[PDB]
């Protein structure tokens, strides 16, 4: 019964066999780990060995348990039902985390790319892309901006992942009212679906910032307002909405707006 390094070798070797190739297995653990992520990032969704899945799960679950995990009650920075936390969303045991997805909803196919979509899929497992693929098959095509779908979170410490597609801003364009309205719809759709599943806590990433080029201050102002308007006007199971920010800049913006 394999150790941690044998599990990692096994997973890498299986994915390389599937491609009919062979690179030289890197030296350092962290090199091989990055090879695994790349291989996972690129795998188009399809039937896969259950032996692989079992080993993937032991491997990724153990990785999850060796991170420093955060529970919702550990977050000290809060205003009523709203919380603000700077940290890695794959280490937060909210009922649901929000994935800022794209319209194909299969995650990120670019190896090592450090968008949240990539990071979430990398830590969750290949099953997340598969579950997403099925919801695409069933609806008969691509996901529109401003909606929300819920999946299992697999080897993350959260129970569910909620996938939403935000608007993108053309380079050098000002944000328009259409753009704002779409981003409000992302937040609301997430909040409504979480309410319908009776979740207690949900964590948002900064939807549409980064790759989709939405300006960070305006995005925050919209995220905060939409969440607040939703809480002020619905009876909801939700008691904790967490704004999970990764950058120092996002932290400073949300902090000033919520507490400053
Ligand atoms: Zn990406």
Numbering used by the authors: 0 to 259
Copied sentences from the primary study:
In some pathogenic microbes, the response to oxidative stress is controlled by a SirTM/zinc-containing macrodomain (Zn-Macro) pair responsible for establishment and removal of the modification, respectively. Strikingly, however, the “catalytic loop” found in all other MacroD-type enzymes (also termed “loop 1”) is replaced with and extended loop containing the zinc-coordinating Cx(4)HxC motif, here termed the Zn-loop. To gain a closer understanding of the functional role of the 3α-bundle and coordinated Zn2+ ion, we solved structures from the three sub-branches of Zn-Macros namely from S. aureus (SauMacro), Methanobrevibacter oralis (MorMacro), and macrodomain-fused SirTM protein (Mfs1) from Fusarium oxysporum f.sp. cubense race 1 (Foc1Mfs1) in their apo form as well as of S. pyogenes (SpyMacro) and MorMacro bound to ADP-ribose (ADPr). In all structures, the Zn2+ ion is tetrahedrally coordinated with three metal-coordination residues within the Zn-loop, while the fourth coordination-contact is exchangeable and is provided by either ADPr, a water molecule, or a symmetry-related protomer within the crystal.
However, our data do not support this binding mode: first, the different orientation of the diphosphate-binding loop in our apo structures shortens the cavity, which would sterically hinder the binding of the dithiolane moiety. Surprisingly, neither MorMacro, which arises from a minimal operon containing only the Zn-Macro/SirTM pair, nor Zn-Macros derived from Msf1 fusion proteins could demodify SpyGcvH-L. In contrast, all Zn-Macros could demodify Glu-/Asp-ADP-ribosylated PARP1 E988Q. On the other hand, the absence of positive interaction surfaces in the other family members of the Zn-Macro family (having neutral to negative surfaces) might provide an energetic barrier to GcvH-L binding and explain the absence of activity from these macrodomains.
